[PDB]
């Protein structure tokens, strides 16, 4: 029945029927699995996106497709490692960044065999506690929204630069004004030491609403001022229509900060009609009622659906 996978474009339904086969299969399989994900034709690019969307959290899956997904990946780290492999760097898949290569650096705990593959891929990318840097998080917040036209995303930014002392959301805030003005909803992303912050401006027909979403400790009077002086230069009247929602998430999501602005982001896109403010205490409230595992899972799901946009 897997004869189709070779008879021209592969549906999406074929590609069910081979996880259907591989989760009900042995070694043979995820050896039949691992090859095709390898190729660089259409059919190894779908067996691919289709693997890391499973191996991602992107799709939902059985309990025993995950475990077979864990076993690909430590094929595909031995076949990344392999001296043949490092012989032939004409084969892209394995000498670029790939869905496939990451998948495969995510296979042990030794990083004495990861380092090549993350130098391919750009340290250890596989870390659950990674302060994400702005240009991974640019990556994904902004590739997140492609399909959304009302949800505007900016280039994450410091809010007070070190040598200076200026607000820079002051600026940002200013020059998006100028070169293309406030969308129906405007995402910030500001960073505070450790802490990114989700700054949300959006209008409530002709009266601008500001939002500042914190998934860590609460914040100093000192930063919440320097946001507000910031948030008037949008129309904001005065400091108490800055509504500040702070609440910890990041005790079992370490430096989980810019996974909460990301994930945020994507709650807005999908319920596009609603009021950010409710969607938002809603989400961060749901979450401190989950349990260490449903939360370490968001963790992890969250970077690698991050990580992705920094791939090909
Ligand atoms: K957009
Ligand atoms: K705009």
Not at 208 to 236: H, M, P, S, V, W
Request: aromatic residues 8%; charged residues 20%.
């Amino acid at each position: 029945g897997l004869e189709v996978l070779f008879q021209g474009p592969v549906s999406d339904e074929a590609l069910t029927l081979l996880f259907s086969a591989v989760e009900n299969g042995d070694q043979n399989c995820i050896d039949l699995l691992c090859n095709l994900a390898l190729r660089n034709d259409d059919l190894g690019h779908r067996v691919e996106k289709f693997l890391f969307d499973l191996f991602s959290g992107k799709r939902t899956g059985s309990s025993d497709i995950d475990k077979k997904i864990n076993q690909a990946c430590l094929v595909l780290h031995q076949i990344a490692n392999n001296d043949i492999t490092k012989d032939n760097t004409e084969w892209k898949k394995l000498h670029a960044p790939s869905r496939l290569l990451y998948m495969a650096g995510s296979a042990t705990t030794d990083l004495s065999k990861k380092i090549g593959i993350a130098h391919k891929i750009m340290e250890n990318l596989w870390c659950g506690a990674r302060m994400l840097s702005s240009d991974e998080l640019a990556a994904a917040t902004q590739g997140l929204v492609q399909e959304s036209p009302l949800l505007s995303v900016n280039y994450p930014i410091g809010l007070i630069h070190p040598t200076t002392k200026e607000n820079i959301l002051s600026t940002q805030l200013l020059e998006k004004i100028a070169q293309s003005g406030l969308s129906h909803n405007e995402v910030f992303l500001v960073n505070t030491g450790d802490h990114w912050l989700l700054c949300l401006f959006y209008k409530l027909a002709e009266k601008i609403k500001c939002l500042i979403f914190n998934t860590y400790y609460d914040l100093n009077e000192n930063t919440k001022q320097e946001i507000i002086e910031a948030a008037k230069i949008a129309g904001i009247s005065e400091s108490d229509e800055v509504n500040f929602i702070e609440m910890n998430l990041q005790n079992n999501v370490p430096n989980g900060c810019g996974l909460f602005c990301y994930h945020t982001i994507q709650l807005l896109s999908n319920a596009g009609q609603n009021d950010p403010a409710t969607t938002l205490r809603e989400f961060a409230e749901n979450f401190l009622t989950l349990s260490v595992e449903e939360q370490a899972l968001f963790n992890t799901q969250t970077r690698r659906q991050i990580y992705e946009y920094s791939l090909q």
